[PDB]
């Protein structure tokens, strides 16, 4: 994560890592939304342009890790996938629209001290929180700049939401309601941004209402990283809230 802090032990306990089975490889980021399901960016699992077309057995995940320059035994876990679920209308052709996907674990991780599931937005919240100016927290182990740059500890960072017209223009990609964008503007005081390898990671907010963390977006994409005049886009988790259940109810 470009221009951002270093995490506090057990800060984003719903953090997940997406691994290529063999060869064991770091691919993307993810969020734990219960003891059986994991959210994520659709493109991590399916992106024909970089010839990417994974199936349950190509990957595995690690939950509750803080540092890679170590291995916290009895702390971190490593589940296996029992089935991936990419959004039907996911548009990898034009604009990575609906870029979202759920993954079922073969066996349900147990919530520990450092492993807890994040909450999903309810019409009520999303309507009130997801406003321009409010802030959310982006987490990942992605690049630390734009070009290697690989961190050893989970990078956090907090970015305000931008108005739709600014994003709608800051890019030449047609952005839908399944996406929003955050980051500081040109001349704002601070900077920060997600970057390659962050995709599919969470973007929580803390409800001033019930005082809980709610993943509102999923890192989807961006032009370069942190470049002034440019804002990172996220999947509007609530929008596709619907889909997310039709998938869990069923199994």
């Amino acid at each position: 994560i470009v221009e951002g802090s270093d995490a506090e032990i057990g800060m984003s306990p719903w953090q997940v890592m997406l691994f290529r089975k063999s060869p064991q490889e770091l691919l993307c980021g993810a969020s734990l939304i219960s003891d059986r399901w994991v959210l994520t960016a659709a493109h991590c699992l399916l992106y024909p342009p970089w010839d990417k077309n994974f199936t349950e057995n190509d990957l595995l995940v690690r939950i509750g890790k803080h540092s890679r320059t170590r291995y916290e035994r009895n702390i971190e876990k490593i589940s296996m996938l029992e089935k991936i679920y990419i959004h039907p209308r996911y548009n990898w052709r034009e604009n990575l629209d609906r870029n979202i996907a759920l993954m079922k674990l073969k066996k349900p991780v147990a919530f520990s001290d450092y492993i807890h599931p994040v909450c999903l937005p309810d019409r009520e919240t999303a309507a009130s929180l997801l406003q321009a100016g409010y802030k959310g927290r982006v987490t990942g182990w992605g690049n630390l700049k734009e070009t290697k740059g690989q961190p050893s500890v989970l990078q956090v960072v907090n970015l305000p939401i931008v108005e739709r017209p600014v994003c709608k223009d800051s890019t030449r990609i047609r952005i839908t309601d399944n996406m929003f964008c955050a980051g500081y503007k040109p001349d704002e005081g601070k900077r920060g941004d997600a970057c390659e390898g962050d995709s599919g990671g969470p973007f929580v907010m803390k409800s001033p209402f019930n005082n809980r963390w709610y993943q509102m977006g999923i890192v989807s994409w961006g032009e370069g990283c942190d470049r002034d005049g440019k804002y990172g886009f996220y999947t509007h988790v609530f929008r596709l809230k619907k889909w997310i259940q039709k998938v869990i109810d069923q199994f």
Binding site: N99, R172, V219, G232
Partner: peptide, 9 residues
């Protein structure tokens, strides 16, 4: 090389 091209993360 001489721009800023949109791409997934």
């Amino acid at each position: 090389t001489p721009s800023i091209l949109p791409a997934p993360r």
